Symmetry: D2
Subunit: 481 residues, 4 copies
Amino acid sequence: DTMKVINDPIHGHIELHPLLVRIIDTPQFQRLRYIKQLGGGYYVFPGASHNRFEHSLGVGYLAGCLVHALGEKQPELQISERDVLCVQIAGLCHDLGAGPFSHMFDGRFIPLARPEVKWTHEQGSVMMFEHLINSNGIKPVMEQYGLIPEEDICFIKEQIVGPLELWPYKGRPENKSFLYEIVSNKRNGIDVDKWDYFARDCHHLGIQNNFDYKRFIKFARVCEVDNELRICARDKEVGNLYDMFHTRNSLHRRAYQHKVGNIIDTMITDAFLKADDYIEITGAGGKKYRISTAIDDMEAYTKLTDNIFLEILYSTDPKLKDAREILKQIEYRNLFKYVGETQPTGQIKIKREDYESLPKEVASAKPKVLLDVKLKAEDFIVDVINMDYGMQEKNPIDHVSFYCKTAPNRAIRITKNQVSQLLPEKFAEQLIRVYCKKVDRKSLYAARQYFVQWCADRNFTKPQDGDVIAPLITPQKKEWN
Amino acid sequence: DTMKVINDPIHGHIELHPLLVRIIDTPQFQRLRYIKQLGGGYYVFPGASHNRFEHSLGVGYLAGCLVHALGEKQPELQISERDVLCVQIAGLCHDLGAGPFSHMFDGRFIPLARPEVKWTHEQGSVMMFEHLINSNGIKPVMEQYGLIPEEDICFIKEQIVGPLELWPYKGRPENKSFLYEIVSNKRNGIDVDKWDYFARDCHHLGIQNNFDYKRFIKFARVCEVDNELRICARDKEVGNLYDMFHTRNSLHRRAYQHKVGNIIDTMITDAFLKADDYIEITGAGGKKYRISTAIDDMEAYTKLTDNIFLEILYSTDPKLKDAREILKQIEYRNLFKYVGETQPTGQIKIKREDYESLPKEVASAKPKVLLDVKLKAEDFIVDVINMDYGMQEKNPIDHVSFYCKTAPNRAIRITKNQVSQLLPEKFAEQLIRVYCKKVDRKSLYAARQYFVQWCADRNFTKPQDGDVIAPLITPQKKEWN
Amino acid sequence: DTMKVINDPIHGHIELHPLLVRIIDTPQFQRLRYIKQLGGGYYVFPGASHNRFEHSLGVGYLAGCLVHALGEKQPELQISERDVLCVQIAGLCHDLGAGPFSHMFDGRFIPLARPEVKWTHEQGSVMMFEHLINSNGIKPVMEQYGLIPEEDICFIKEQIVGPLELWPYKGRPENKSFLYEIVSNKRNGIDVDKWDYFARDCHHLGIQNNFDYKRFIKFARVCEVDNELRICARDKEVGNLYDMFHTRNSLHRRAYQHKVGNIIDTMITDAFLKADDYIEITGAGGKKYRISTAIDDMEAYTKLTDNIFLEILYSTDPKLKDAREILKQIEYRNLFKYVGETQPTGQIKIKREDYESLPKEVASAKPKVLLDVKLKAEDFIVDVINMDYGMQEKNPIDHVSFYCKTAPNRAIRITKNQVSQLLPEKFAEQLIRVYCKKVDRKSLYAARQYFVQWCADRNFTKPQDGDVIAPLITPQKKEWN
Amino acid sequence: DTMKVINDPIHGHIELHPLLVRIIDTPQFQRLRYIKQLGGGYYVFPGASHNRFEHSLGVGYLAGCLVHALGEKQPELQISERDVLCVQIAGLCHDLGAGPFSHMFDGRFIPLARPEVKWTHEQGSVMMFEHLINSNGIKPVMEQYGLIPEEDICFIKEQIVGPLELWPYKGRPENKSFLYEIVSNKRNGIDVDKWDYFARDCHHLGIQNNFDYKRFIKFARVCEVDNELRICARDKEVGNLYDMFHTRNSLHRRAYQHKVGNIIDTMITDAFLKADDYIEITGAGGKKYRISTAIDDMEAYTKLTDNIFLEILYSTDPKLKDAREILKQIEYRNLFKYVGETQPTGQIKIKREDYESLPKEVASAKPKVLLDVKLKAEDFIVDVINMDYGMQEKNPIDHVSFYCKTAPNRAIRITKNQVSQLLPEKFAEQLIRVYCKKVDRKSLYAARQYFVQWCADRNFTKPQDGDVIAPLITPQKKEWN
Ligand SMILES: Nc1ncnc2c1ncn2[C@H]1C[C@H](O)[C@@H](COP(=O)(O)OP(=O)(O)OP(=O)(O)O)O1
Ligand SMILES: Nc1ncnc2c1ncn2[C@H]1C[C@H](O)[C@@H](COP(=O)(O)OP(=O)(O)OP(=O)(O)O)O1
Ligand SMILES: Nc1ncnc2c1ncn2[C@H]1C[C@H](O)[C@@H](COP(=O)(O)OP(=O)(O)OP(=O)(O)O)O1
Ligand SMILES: Nc1ncnc2c1ncn2[C@H]1C[C@H](O)[C@@H](COP(=O)(O)OP(=O)(O)OP(=O)(O)O)O1
Ligand SMILES: [Mg+2]
Ligand SMILES: [Zn+2]
Ligand SMILES: [Zn+2]
Ligand SMILES: [Zn+2]
């Protein structure tokens, strides 16, 4: 069979090898048509209707581009078409574990529904990949195209999830180390996955992207670093790399962590939690699963998509009333009310196990103001957001290797002070958003008082609108004035 | 409650008047989030994931822009903000009647499922608008903002569907005739609906748009034409108008009538037909409706979206197997095979009552060829496509009024001969596509022989691949040599 | 000496081989930075400030892209590194013969200044290329990078200008005929030169076209046609090809032949004609040349760019007063006034021999109206423009070869009747613009009367604004209603 | 007479009031067509051929957009069409004082040619505006459109250059203070000039823009701040503001201060210095001026554009030989060699009085390497570049006023700590680039040794490629290891 050409609004005309086509045309891959890339973000940015499917095509394409470029500039690397196909397949299949509304599912729902389990999106992708391969007879097509299914399937999985557990990989040896930096870069976070979603999300959101992946590809080489051949960027391109991470941060501030988008993800998750006992998804054998248990059976998970939303919204069963009602309130735009935003000060970090107690803290605050209404713990929502450069408190550029034009095969390192003094001094912070479920004027007022008092007691930052929303609280706070 | 700003990737930041927001935040309008603008086109162009929702937003916005422009350039027209709001509401609500997969529903499915009924997309939009209004207490909100519900609701409906069936409109008199030309121009098809979907579809498909609606708006005026005030374009802009329709035609040939997109629409429709007896959609009172009859109850139709596709796909009920299988074959990319394309010659038009007889005609033919495998009528699909400039055989530019720079309040007409000799000689044609449901090598060979013989017998145009797919048949037709 | 990466707003990051860089960094090439691509068009479209330099880079690049794609899809063509470099150089240098204001120079100025000489842009490019090579010691660099200067220099020139005097080319044999279809396609006009200026001019003008060269490249193959290996397009891409020419026509209608742009080209050409005796350009040995004779010495022509405009504009010598004044009137925007536009009918063409005589005719007509101030022939300008599909009366798609997917190695032909009846029936037409050098109210009125009467007498098309500018004249002609 | 529509690739179709058209169609304004926006940058980014003309149109337009938007949103500000016209004219004319290659002229050339005179670009623009007005009879045209020349010309000048001397402005009273923040914001640098060149320069450079000015305009209001009426942004837009300045910094890093671009500006400046004694520009009365003295006579400065470059390049006079040689060395791409880049450490700032002594410091350094060639001070170039957020050491966002959704007319302040911990800690830094005029391998090696030795001695930052370009020097510095 022959190659297919496909037209993508981001990358243009992409060539798809017949093996890739065989992989794409399976229920396991096509399911990605029914999962929105940005989930609840679509309910704030109406252009964001794009799905995981097209993004996956993009990542496969981009993975291919990088490996190809590397190969043509450096034939001594012995990059084979087999290598190219494996990196392409890895890029294509990286997101196969996506659940309903993408990262709402693994980031919000599963942690609340199944706290005992260790679930990652990537593990999901490996399992779903295995299921695709075994359910569609892919191994003989792989062999037909020069792949060796054992090592190569191992390699693809390793590209997606990391080492399956000092060279920890089995799919490829150290002299092909660079191949593991293409799809998901565990070392510094610089990969083609990011490059695709920056561009694609920007295209759909109506926000413009300022990162040029093509330039990066032009300037990329492979050099020896610690007895492995790794990808190195050109030294003077370091500025661009800092900008890339800045871009990432910007996209999170403007879109991915938009206050309303997040509150909508929250409400939908609440609906799924109230629906979990009663929704049935039929997997292997005819066995029944729940939304929270579909992850245990790939045939059921294959059928778990954004559809569940609509299944709940359109239901007539009384047992789903509660869930249904919540979704209906989303349609009427009767959302939880944003009360405010604050940050911790000094060294103070908030841990996830402390998240659960935060609404209790806010309601327990004691403002010295006349309050019509007393508010409870369940009236508040506290969303904690980690904003960083992808490596917690670390500078990812400290984990990038560079080359100089005068000696292109010699890897070097570049420190932050060698670049600019206008760069961040810290690379991680927390944003605390507080919302109130009671929508009346007085409850909202009260909630503002509770919130600002709470910020004052914990020495958090002064809310930007503090002097307007709670003028009796902010002045009696040494700093904030 | 204040105005909202929304960020659209096509138009940028749009202001939404609180009345519009009240209309948008209803189940009848939010419903459009679950219907793909281009339906089956998404299975060919992976960027085409956009839904009717954002498009309706865009059209409302642009209607607003045009009316506002007309108003600020010519205050003597007495355009009120009430007029602006009514025009905006009409733009927002024109597609309220969209069914699953947009024009697949009213264009393919409903005509086959219920041939006796006269259902149009627009009338559907009117009924759904009425339903939204009554189910959400909009009338007093309209009144709150200076609208007069009887006249204005009548006006909005008239803008969507035309005269509800001597000046035929009741919502506005002849001296505001131009207002009826903004949302859906029944006279020549030049309206803001088209502008939005050209721009938007081009953005998602990965095809670049070459029509400049902002320029058109800049050059628009209103002049007296036969005792009504109508929209007139600048004379010198006539070329652009021809180009617009050319653009329209291009999009239809590149995207909207794509051979695979159409066969996918055909298969989906076939599945919906096979599922029709068994799917239940709960409408008013709790009464059950089917996919083909949901159009009889707006409460039921509200819940009729692209979701059914998945409901059929995810089903386990044996009664749905047939339907299900069809959808599954789409997932495996086992589509009916494109055999070829031809056109009629001379004066010959194919009428709709004769569509049904075309596969039998193809199935008949005597290719005088080595007869491999015999094929039956039910093995063929024949799709007839009417390609025109929107007014059947008529030139729409003959129904446009122009003004010249030396006398901008004086309307004139421009004939085709006054423009260019490189323009089309005909403004309507028919396209005949033939596919075969038997997908094997020999069946395909056979189908090609039957098809070319059929083209020869009907004196149709010679297929482009004719000399290759049927080399024993093409020489027997002098005209083709 | 390594490759350089250069960033182009149209094509992105382009790689330039050291040989190409050596060619670029010469006075003969850098000269193209000082010559505007669209000449007078910048005085109508303020974004059109781009120069021939960047465009030449673009064409070199695209030429390379096409030949590389062909090579990798079909290794049996034996396309060498040398072939790629020669085609790139051809693209790079196809415009070396550009004169001040580009096509104003060879299209308007030289024919008026020296009607006896045979000057073309292409021959100018061959001459300038020879000069660049010889003045900068390029030949040994060519051999240093694997080129064979005699054969390859011949090949490059042939790519630019066509056969230097049956297989007429000496640079490459018939089995590489396809290489001659890349930079300048004399057979059908489909080349990378067009692709680049379509994209670039659109980028700068602020108008967009819908032609996708990248898609074309994806679908291009080389097949056998008449003992030649020629480039063939995929059959179903024929529509796009027709569209490509539509695009061309549109760009000419909107931008390249803009009425005001053309009148500015006319005025600048007049200033240059009036300046020719007095501007001195120093050529070889120190010999002096004029603007019209610099083409006789490449050392002088090297210094002949748009700069001359400013020299004339900034001059103080009385011998240049006339030239200067004209340019000054351009700065004050006192341009000749457009009076109107009309066309001839079907089978009769106006050939160059009559252009000179057209103003006398207009002034000669006797419009039965009160006109106080009579105009002479010298008060008029008549610009007639040939609009075609690039091959006079011919359909260029009749000269395109195609292949179908069932047999990609077999070239076939496709007729207009096989594609659509919505296409043009004719492929060439003439446009007549009339201007008046007298700019006062009464002179303008008079001019309108004369012009419309002239249209009436000659049975040309009715001017679009005819009933407005000459309401006393149009009633004498029944056909015009 | 009437308005003109003009098509700009950045802003689309702009309307120009007849007064603006009158101002534009003068030699003083049209002059801007012959001065490149980015000067020497065109010799690095080939798309950057745009001139000051189109940019000035853009700023006029945007100024109009902002004042207009403020006007419809808050009629209580009493913004008149007279105010709108005056702001448009100021935007239109802010750059009239541009010299050849824009900021090369006022930034490099004039300080070297005439260090005694105090010339700014802005004062230049004011003088040139006065000249335009007086030489073209603009005043009665101003009066014709409702403007009052005495007050209004003053207003325009004040908008460009600031107070010509409580409330320091005379053109408009304090209740129109916000009008002075539109074209050139002397308070915090947030103005429409920046918005336009960010967008335009990005469009031409092939760099993508990340700032959304339209969104800013939607969220802009006027509020009372410290007994003055100022433009305030919505609180939540604070992030966008920080990003805006980041964007600015990025544009300076990638394009405006590109090392090769700067060295090309440097060489051009030297050529102008060697040409100054010999080039003649004819000013008022017939008096002769130099490149360096043309600023003393507006009639002469009108004729001072990028043309001088070509005059020098095309000259034959022996007295200009040296100058000529320099330009020729640019054409052959024989440029001064970039040696390296470094920064001071800690609190150490380099003072401007010390710039001249730096090449001497570098040449005086004694690297312990065996050198063939010794270099002198005149062989080195040391470029010190101030990179900041537009207000030297200050955070400009500390000089921005914000408003909250709950009380849109109550201005507030927002501190850096209320926004993010990932923001710059410093807002100003110094960049030191070193180049060598000797271009042979050995001199370049030597220059590198001298340079890195100098960096070590001054305790500057370690050059990024230090260990590669100078491996015998870097180990001597503990701080660098
Ligand atoms: N004229 C066009 N311009 C831009 N994109 C197009 C055009 N036509 C189709 N596309 C898109 C749709 C697909 O995503 C991709 C490939 O389409 P296409 O070439 O029509 O494949 P196809 O499979 O239907 O034809 P075939 O099987 O005969 O090769 O490009
Ligand atoms: N920084 C941004 N840049 C571009 N678009 C944005 C940005 N932030 C949000 N958007 C989009 C999302 C929405 O479509 C639109 C409005 O967003 P936003 O201003 O955040 O409204 P909001 O309703 O959440 O805030 P508020 O109610 O306080 O005014 O702009
Ligand atoms: N950060 C950037 N982003 C986009 N384009 C850039 C950037 N920096 C430079 N450019 C452009 C300018 C040129 O057209 C092209 C090449 O520039 P550049 O990489 O700086 O080459 P260079 O010759 O100055 O460096 P070097 O010789 O050290 O390799 O890219
Ligand atoms: N069809 C077009 N599409 C886009 N831009 C155009 C088109 N035609 C012209 N332009 C540009 C060029 C100018 O910048 C601007 C105005 O052009 P145009 O409307 O033709 O002015 P004009 O002065 O020649 O006509 P007139 O004086 O008769 O109204 O738009
Ligand atoms: Mg809001
Ligand atoms: Zn991903
Ligand atoms: Zn529509
Ligand atoms: Zn060209």
